[PDB]
Scaffold this active site. Structure first.
Site, PDB file in Angstrom:
ATOM      1  N   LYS A 152       0.828  -1.199   0.000  1.00  0.00           N
ATOM      2  CA  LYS A 152       0.000   0.000   0.000  1.00  0.00           C
ATOM      3  C   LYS A 152       0.865   1.253   0.000  1.00  0.00           C
ATOM      4  O   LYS A 152       0.498   2.278  -0.577  1.00  0.00           O
ATOM      5  CB  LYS A 152      -0.943   0.001   1.205  1.00  0.00           C
TER       6      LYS A 152
ATOM      7  N   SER B 182      -1.006  14.833  26.959  1.00  0.00           N
ATOM      8  CA  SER B 182      -0.107  15.485  26.013  1.00  0.00           C
ATOM      9  C   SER B 182       0.482  16.783  26.566  1.00  0.00           C
ATOM     10  O   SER B 182       1.546  17.222  26.131  1.00  0.00           O
ATOM     11  CB  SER B 182      -0.837  15.763  24.699  1.00  0.00           C
TER      12      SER B 182
ATOM     13  N   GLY C 169      -5.633  17.721  22.757  1.00  0.00           N
ATOM     14  CA  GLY C 169      -6.979  17.322  22.392  1.00  0.00           C
ATOM     15  C   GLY C 169      -7.944  17.560  23.534  1.00  0.00           C
ATOM     16  O   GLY C 169      -9.120  17.838  23.313  1.00  0.00           O
TER      17      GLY C 169
HETATM   18  C1  LIG Z   1      -6.788   6.772  24.565  1.00  0.00           C
HETATM   19  C2  LIG Z   1      -5.919   6.123  25.469  1.00  0.00           C
HETATM   20  C3  LIG Z   1      -5.302   6.836  26.495  1.00  0.00           C
HETATM   21  N1  LIG Z   1      -4.422   6.212  27.421  1.00  0.00           N
HETATM   22  C4  LIG Z   1      -3.708   7.010  28.488  1.00  0.00           C
HETATM   23  C5  LIG Z   1      -2.415   7.602  27.861  1.00  0.00           C
HETATM   24  C6  LIG Z   1      -2.857   9.062  27.512  1.00  0.00           C
HETATM   25  O1  LIG Z   1      -1.750  10.047  27.397  1.00  0.00           O
HETATM   26  C7  LIG Z   1      -3.722   9.368  28.718  1.00  0.00           C
HETATM   27  C8  LIG Z   1      -4.710  10.497  28.408  1.00  0.00           C
HETATM   28  O2  LIG Z   1      -5.634  10.067  27.442  1.00  0.00           O
HETATM   29  P1  LIG Z   1      -5.930  10.980  26.133  1.00  0.00           P
HETATM   30  O3  LIG Z   1      -6.209  12.410  26.515  1.00  0.00           O
HETATM   31  O4  LIG Z   1      -7.151  10.284  25.368  1.00  0.00           O
HETATM   32  N2  LIG Z   1      -4.460  10.882  25.229  1.00  0.00           N
HETATM   33  P2  LIG Z   1      -3.533  12.377  25.254  1.00  0.00           P
HETATM   34  O5  LIG Z   1      -3.640  13.415  26.339  1.00  0.00           O
HETATM   35  O6  LIG Z   1      -1.999  11.807  25.138  1.00  0.00           O
HETATM   36  O7  LIG Z   1      -3.756  13.055  23.807  1.00  0.00           O
HETATM   37  P3  LIG Z   1      -4.544  14.373  23.428  1.00  0.00           P
HETATM   38  O8  LIG Z   1      -3.760  15.640  23.380  1.00  0.00           O
HETATM   39  O9  LIG Z   1      -5.867  14.393  24.245  1.00  0.00           O
HETATM   40  O10 LIG Z   1      -5.187  14.026  21.998  1.00  0.00           O
HETATM   41  O11 LIG Z   1      -4.414   8.149  29.028  1.00  0.00           O
HETATM   42  C9  LIG Z   1      -4.184   4.888  27.312  1.00  0.00           C
HETATM   43  O12 LIG Z   1      -3.433   4.332  28.104  1.00  0.00           O
HETATM   44  N3  LIG Z   1      -4.785   4.119  26.307  1.00  0.00           N
HETATM   45  C10 LIG Z   1      -5.645   4.747  25.374  1.00  0.00           C
HETATM   46  O13 LIG Z   1      -6.158   4.055  24.487  1.00  0.00           O
HETATM   47 MN   LIG Z   2      -5.374  14.318  26.651  1.00  0.00          MN
END
Ligand SMILES: Cc1cn([C@H]2C[C@H](O)[C@@H](COP(=O)(O)NP(=O)(O)OP(=O)(O)O)O2)c(=O)[nH]c1=O
Ligand SMILES: [Mn+2]
Ligand SMILES: [Mn+2]
Ligand code: NA
Ligand code: NA
Length: 326
Positions: free
Chosen positions: A63, A171, A180
């Site tokens: 792909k 993040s 996000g």
């Molecule tokens: C979605 C998800 C999150 N997590 C943990 C790691 C993420 O850093 C933490 C926060 O979830 P999130 O806000 O959905 N991921 P994020 O803060 O890294 O990304 P963003 O800036 O919200 O998009 O929870 C998992 O361990 N498995 C997962 O499938």
């Molecule tokens: Mn997050």
DNA sequence: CCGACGTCGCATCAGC
DNA sequence: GCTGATGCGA
DNA sequence: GTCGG
């Protein structure tokens, strides 16, 4: 963004396999491939070059060749042209609507943003709120706004009890210029793995954040996890800030480091660390890292005094939060 | 080939 | 009401 | 879909 086109294609295929095919491992296969290619420091010239990377096999290599040659992918083109796939893919973007409910709705003929609004009575509470702030939840949060949200949350937390410690993770803790959502870890000395000396520890914080009209909505709520909506306050005559998703997690004080490691992420990194942990003969969750015995059953929690201790156990060299963006 | 693929919290449902 | 499965999400 | 064994 060296291979932005490639990782986009794979991400779109992952979404298809998860939302439409309901094949979660296919979804993860594509997401792993996208991740490892994303951090490949070369502009990929061929599918064979990509095949060398762990997670990239034969089918994805082909792909990548098709994409590099023509600029797109026939398999995705067709999927885009399919009404059912396109409608199901869309509905899943509403928070609370997954692959199952999306397919269910399309079967009833509910398949547009407009279809949903006139059928509010057929959504559960989570799905209702997800629809309500559908536009707002599409938008990113600039780090500046995150910094405002941080001081509000951390200060409100201080006012309920000075012994609450609140740490913004996700993040943001990885130093992202935009996020996000907001992810908040909460610890209180009355809540350990050894007892819960105080009920409603998370409730009182939720309550307080609601009283100052920061938290505006609730998606789900338990004794350790809050999932809901928040909004920054705006000055006079100025347009309102978008509503934002917020996750709050109350984790036992003595298990902070497993908690802060888990919630820091990234999603794939967390998935990868635990996968590697199994390979090393351990199991990691948000509370503990436990060793697997000769039989395969987890033993007693191993002592943890830092994020680095967890890395040491599974024989990984330590990585700063800003280097965990897989 | 072919089994295995991270791990858990909350909402909701079936079945009793 | 409880328990266990399923759906959705972190 | 990919891979270790
Ligand atoms: C979605 C998800 C999150 N997590 C943990 C790691 C993420 O850093 C933490 C926060 O979830 P999130 O806000 O959905 N991921 P994020 O803060 O890294 O990304 P963003 O800036 O919200 O998009 O929870 C998992 O361990 N498995 C997962 O499938
Ligand atoms: Mn997050
Ligand atoms: Mn989150
Ligand atoms: Na490979
Ligand atoms: Na959704």
């Amino acid at each position: 963004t060296l291979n932005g086109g490639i990782t986009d294609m794979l991400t779109e295929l992952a979404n298809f396999e998860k939302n439409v095919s309901q094949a979660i491992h296919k979804y993860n296969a594509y997401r792993k491939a996208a991740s490892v290619i994303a951090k490949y420091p070369h502009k990929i010239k061929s599918g064979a070059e990509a095949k060398k990377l762990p997670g990239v096999g034969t089918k994805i290599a082909e792909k990548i060749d098709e994409f590099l040659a023509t600029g797109k992918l026939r398999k995705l083109e067709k999927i885009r042209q399919d009404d059912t796939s396109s409608s199901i893919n869309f509905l899943t973007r509403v928070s609370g609507i997954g692959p199952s409910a999306a397919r269910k709705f399309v079967d009833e003929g509910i398949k547009t943003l407009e279809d949903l609004r006139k059928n509010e009575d057929k959504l559960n509470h989570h799905q209702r709120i997800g629809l309500k702030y559908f536009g707002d939840f599409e938008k990113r949060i600039p780090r500046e706004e995150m910094l405002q949200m941080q001081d509000i949350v951390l200060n409100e937390v201080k006012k309920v009890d000075s012994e609450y410690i609140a740490t913004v993770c996700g993040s943001f803790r990885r130093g992202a210029e935009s996020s996000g959502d907001m992810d908040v870890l909460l610890t209180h000395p009355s809540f350990t793995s050894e007892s819960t000396k105080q009920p409603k520890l998370l409730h009182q914080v939720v309550e307080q954040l609601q009283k100052v009209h920061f938290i505006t909505d609730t998606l789900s709520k338990g004794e350790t996890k809050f999932m809901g909506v928040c909004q920054l306050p705006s000055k006079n005559d100025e347009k309102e800030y978008p509503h934002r998703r917020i996750d709050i997690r109350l984790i036992p004080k003595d298990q902070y480091y497993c908690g802060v490691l888990y919630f820091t992420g990234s999603d794939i990194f967390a998935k990868n660390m635990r996968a590697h942990a199994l390979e090393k003969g351990f199991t990691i969750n948000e509370y503990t890292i436990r060793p697997l015995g000769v039989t395969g059953v987890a033993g007693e929690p191993l002592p943890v005094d830092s994020e680095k201790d967890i890395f040491d156990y599974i024989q990984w060299k330590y990585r700063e939060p800003k280097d965990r963006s897989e």
